[PDB]
Design a protein around this ligand. Structure first.
Ligand code: NAI
Ligand code: FMN
Ligand code: SF4
Ligand code: SF4
Ligand code: SF4
Ligand code: FES
Ligand code: FES
Ligand code: K
Lengths: 430, 44, 213, 230
């Protein structure tokens, strides 16, 4: 197979993504959920982990780590401590709203995924870290959790298999840095959302010191479908080591911003011209595209023509996949102002525990504000690049790298616009 | 039949301030006994 | 805008505050949600519970939450100051947050912000003199495909126009409660030009399963 | 024998399991620069000054928090280690206030000493620095919070050895201040020892403040007689 995309409705993972059907237990069980879960729980954690590993499912959070190996990290005998599975439902990344749609429209799929994942790694219970701002989503999730509890699917003797499994929902308090898995673990324990250092990994010391595995909503809710349809069914899509279907949130200067499921290795041009309704003012009006939300560098029109929206093609285009969040900027935009606002957002969401991010993000904010104003010298632009090289790779967590990447991409792709802006200011003001 | 032109998430308009908390209070009766570390706090 | 506290007559440890017995039962359930030996893990929602008791957090819910969980008060102070949801200043009855992040400013959220400013007659971060509306700006709230948007109390209002937000304001002033949903043609996240996907009905259970399961 | 052999600068040494990089580097008689690590306090790993490079590994690890493994070779004088040290020093000195003549830590300051030893020689920060509101935490420890570097030895000392649990880190981002969030008078039997563990002049001795300078002081060792601990 060479042409990737044009996914039929028979292969979409998340039916009722648009909320047109019932989201409760009677609606979810009529769409295929909660079917033959007892045999899945009874077959074996080794079989479930092997089926996940053969499927080639990778990280849907944006890190790109393979899910099967990471889930099999905790497949070890216990030392007397309980084991925990935690679902990351914070989703503080700009441009990203797919997990909100999953927790608002398919909560029972998330609960069945929690049960299947907890069976796979022998977890004692499940914790869902919902976002604080998603109050209605959390209420709907807890309604579905109660409806699944009163049906005997979870709890004591879950799904009639003799395996106990408990589920919890914990609300956040408005912090994007709580989306990091170690900062999420620290936030559940009742401290500030300040990340830990690896090693020790969460598979050894996690929440409450117990072995704990943290996984995204989109990589948990697909696990019962992974077990039911089979590994090769998910491996049929995309390129090699890029299998699966992805939710894409397209927003920006676009006629119809929307969330849509598609194949992994679909070209970006086909997706943005088919599902998004096209760039405003035609294709020639397009100026830049950020393919993964605020964590990834942008790419101009010269790279956006024949780019495949998977991990390998995007990492070959000196950017990252991110959370498949397509932010589109046309020619009627102040691009430097947009990157300055992104950097100011990164300044307003940074825990401040470790020094290089805590100082360099503020320094980058001042430099980019002066660049938007234009009050600098041109060589300082190159100096700003060096500041990024003093942040990327010297931080506790990846928020500093996630702030250094868009500045590097903006400089590397639109240095002429920056320098012409500031020399125009220098001419017209001095 | 089949309906595809109506939004079914109409319950979220009728949520009060304490719906999450009272839902947790009602759901607390279905939960397993929590494990014990041997002490009531690490500061003990 | 200050991360340190000074003793005022309206904000001091001697300010009276207490939990209702139903809220005590809710706090007990929240504590029982966590493993034994880790009572401090209940400090995150319970303090937020106190916010739902008052609308803002003086330093009397801080000490009370520290007392009823056997934690030092400085941990509660750290938790309240680190997180932006916990209002340590008395906000208005309807807290309005406007998203000014790049996928929201791309769809001209500045016009909506200026419409709110010229309607309520306030500034950024200022409180209306009838103690009803508070207007601040925050980061991305997860409604990027329905940008621009606002968040009033615990209700999302997405795909807004200046006419839409001024209608929301003058209907909120009348005592009624608006509809927490997008105000455009689409309902939640579908494209406005019809369903580009999931036009076919779902296929139900027992579809595409493998042998041996 | 459970002890494993590691390599520093091409030289073999025999260390115990669970031993960090910095302990092995001290075992071979070298001192990796540090701000937040302490041999009597818990590991925080946030100052990021102790970053070194393991060979055949394209990411610098924190020597104060990374356990060693068998066969590792540690390069403590390579190019990227010096680049990381200079970058961390520049970030630390970006918001530090120009208070060296009027600060009691001058002449015995860790920040000045390792800035001379491992940092650069000029500042590229052309913007305006931050300013932190001062605090009053007692009649013994003079407090000027503008000079702090958020090393969090205050916090670990107050929570682990003194066990008073009064100090904390309020706020988020670069505006986070190390304080008590209220006018709390931190008084204990071991308060003044924080003046020992502050690497900067943020905390100073109030009776000793603006009285002398460490380079003109003769040191004479003696025994305490006020208490019977000796
Ligand atoms: N999904 C979202 O909303 C957002 C996602 N991101 C993305 O998240 C990523 C950063 O997060 P991380 O989880 O730190 O990424 P990655 O470096 O850590 O690691 C992915 C997973 O593998 C594990 N792991 C890493 N190194 C390991 C090792 N040597 N041995 C064993 N396990 C190991 C981690 O614990 C984690 O569970 C970036 O790619 C960033 O773009 C960033 C912002 C928001
Ligand atoms: C600063 C930061 C914020 C993050 N926020 C989220 C988030 O909100 N949601 C999420 O699923 N992952 C987030 N992540 C990624 C997680 O660290 C981790 O990759 C994810 O929770 C699970 O990855 P997985 O898809 O392989 O299971 C964030 C990472 C960083 C560095
Ligand atoms: S990189 Fe920034 S957000 Fe991440 S741990 Fe360091 S200070 Fe915190
Ligand atoms: S603490 Fe700061 S002001 Fe004092 S001597 Fe050191 S660098 Fe100078
Ligand atoms: S005042 Fe000194 S000891 Fe305390 S956190 Fe700051 S630098 Fe560290
Ligand atoms: S950028 Fe505004 S809701 Fe995400
Ligand atoms: S000494 Fe290791 S990070 Fe500070
Ligand atoms: K000192």
């Amino acid at each position: 197979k060479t042409s990737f995309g044009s996914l039929k409705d028979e292969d979409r993972i998340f039916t009722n993504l648009y909320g047109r059907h019932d989201w409760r237990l009677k609606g979810a069980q009529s769409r295929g959920d909660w079917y033959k879960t007892k045999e899945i729980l009874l077959k074996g954690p080794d079989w479930i982990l092997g089926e996940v590993k053969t499927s080639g499912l990778r990280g849907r959070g944006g890190a790109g780590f393979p899910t099967g190996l990471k889930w099999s990290f905790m497949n070890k005998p216990s030392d007397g401590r309980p084991k925990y599975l935690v679902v990351n439902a914070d989703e503080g990344e700009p441009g990203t709203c797919k997990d909100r749609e999953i927790i608002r429209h398919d909560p029972h799929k998330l609960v069945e995924g929690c049960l299947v994942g907890g069976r796979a790694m022998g977890a004692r219970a499940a914790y869902i870290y919902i976002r604080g701002e998603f109050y209605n989503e959390a209420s709907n999730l807890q309604v579905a959790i109660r409806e699944a509890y009163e049906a005997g699917l979870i709890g004591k003797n879950a799904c009639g298999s003799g395996y106990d499994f408990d589920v919890f929902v914990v609300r956040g308090a408005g912090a994007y840095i709580c989306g990091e898995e170690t900062a999420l673990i620290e936030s559940i324990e009742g401290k500030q959302g300040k990340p830990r250092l690896k090693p020790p990994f969460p598979a050894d010391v996690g929440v409450f010191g117990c072995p704990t595995t943290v996984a995204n909503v989109e990589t948990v809710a697909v696990s019962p479908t992974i077990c039911r349809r089979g590994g090769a069914w998910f491996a049929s899509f995309g390129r090699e080591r890029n299998s699966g279907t992805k939710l894409f949130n397209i927003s920006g200067h676009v006629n119809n911003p929307c969330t849509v499921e598609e194949e992994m290795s679909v070209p970006l041009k086909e997706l943005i011209e088919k599902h998004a309704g096209g760039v405003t003012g035609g294709w020639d009006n397009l100026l830049a595209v950020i393919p993964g939300g605020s964590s990834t560098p942008l790419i101009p029109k010269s790279v956006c023509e024949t780019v495949l929206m998977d991990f390998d093609a995007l990492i070959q285009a000196q950017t990252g996949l991110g959370t498949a969040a397509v932010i589109v900027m046309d020619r009627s935009t102040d691009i430097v102002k947009a990157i300055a606002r992104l950097i100011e957002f990164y300044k307003h969401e940074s825990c401040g525990q470790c020094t290089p991010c805590r100082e360099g993000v503020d320094w980058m904010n001042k430099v980019m504000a002066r660049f938007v104003r234009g009050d600098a010298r041109p060589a300082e632009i190159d100096s700003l690049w060096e500041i990024s090289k003093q942040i990327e790779g010297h931080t506790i967590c990846a928020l500093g790298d996630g702030a250094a990447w868009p500045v590097q991409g903006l400089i590397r792709h639109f240095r002429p616009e920056l320098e012409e802006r500031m020399q125009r200011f220098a001419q017209q003001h001095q | 039949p089949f309906d595809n032109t109506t939004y079914k998430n109409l319950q979220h308009h009728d949520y009060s301030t304490y719906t999450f908390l009272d839902l947790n209070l009602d759901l607390s009766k279905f939960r397993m006994p929590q494990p014990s570390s041997g002490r009531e706090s690490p500061r003990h | 805008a200050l991360f340190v506290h000074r003793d005022t007559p309206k904000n001091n440890p001697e300010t009276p505050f207490d939990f209702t017995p139903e809220n005590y039962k809710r706090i007990e359930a929240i504590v029982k949600n966590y493993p034994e030996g880790h009572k401090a893990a209940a400090v995150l929602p319970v303090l937020d519970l106190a916010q739902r008791q008052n609308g803002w957090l003086p330093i009397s819910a801080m000490n009370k939450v520290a007392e009823i969980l056997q934690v030092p008060p400085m941990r509660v102070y750290e938790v309240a100051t680190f997180y932006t949801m916990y209002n340590r200043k008395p906000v208005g009855k309807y807290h309005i947050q406007v998203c000014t992040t790049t996928p929201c400013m791309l769809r001209n959220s500045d016009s909506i912000l200026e419409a709110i400013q010229k309607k309520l007659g306030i500034k950024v971060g200022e409180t209306t003199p009838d103690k009803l509306f508070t207007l601040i700006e925050v980061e991305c709230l997860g409604a990027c495909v329905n940008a621009p948007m606002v968040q009033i109390n615990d209700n999302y209002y997405e795909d807004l126009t200046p006419k839409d937000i001024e209608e929301i304001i003058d209907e909120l002033k009348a005592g009624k409660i608006p509809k927490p949903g997008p105000r455009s043609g689409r309902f939640s996240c579908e494209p406005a030009g019809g369903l580009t996907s999931l036009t076919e009905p779902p296929k139900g259970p027992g579809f595409g399963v493998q042998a041996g399961l | 024998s459970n002890l494993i052999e590691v390599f520093v600068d091409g030289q073999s040494v025999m260390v115990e399991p669970g031993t960090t990089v910095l302990q092995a580097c001290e075992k071979v008689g070298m001192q990796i620069p540090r701000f937040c690590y302490h041999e009597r306090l818990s590991v925080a790993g946030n100052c990021r000054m102790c970053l070194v490079e393991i060979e055949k590994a394209p990411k610098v690890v924190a020597a104060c928090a990374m356990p060693v493994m068998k066969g590792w070779n540690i390069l403590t004088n390579s190019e990227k280690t010096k680049k990381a040290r200079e970058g961390v020093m520049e970030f630390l000195l970006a918001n530090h206030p120009l208070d060296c003549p009027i600060c009691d830590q001058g002449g015995e300051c860790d920040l000045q000493d390792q800035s001379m030893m491992f940092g650069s020689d000029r500042s590229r920060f052309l913007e305006g620095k931050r300013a932190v509101e001062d605090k009053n935490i007692g009649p013994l420890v003079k407090t000027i919070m503008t000079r702090c570097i958020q090393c969090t030895r205050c916090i670990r000392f107050a929570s682990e050895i003194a066990g008073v649990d009064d100090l904390g880190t309020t706020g988020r981002g670069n505006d986070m201040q190390v304080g008590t969030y209220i006018e709390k008078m931190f008084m204990s039997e071991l308060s003044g020892n924080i003046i020992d563990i502050c690497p900067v002049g943020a905390l100073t001795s109030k009776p000793y403040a603006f009285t002398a300078r460490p380079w003109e002081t003769r040191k004479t060792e003696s025994i305490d007689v006020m208490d019977a601990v000796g």
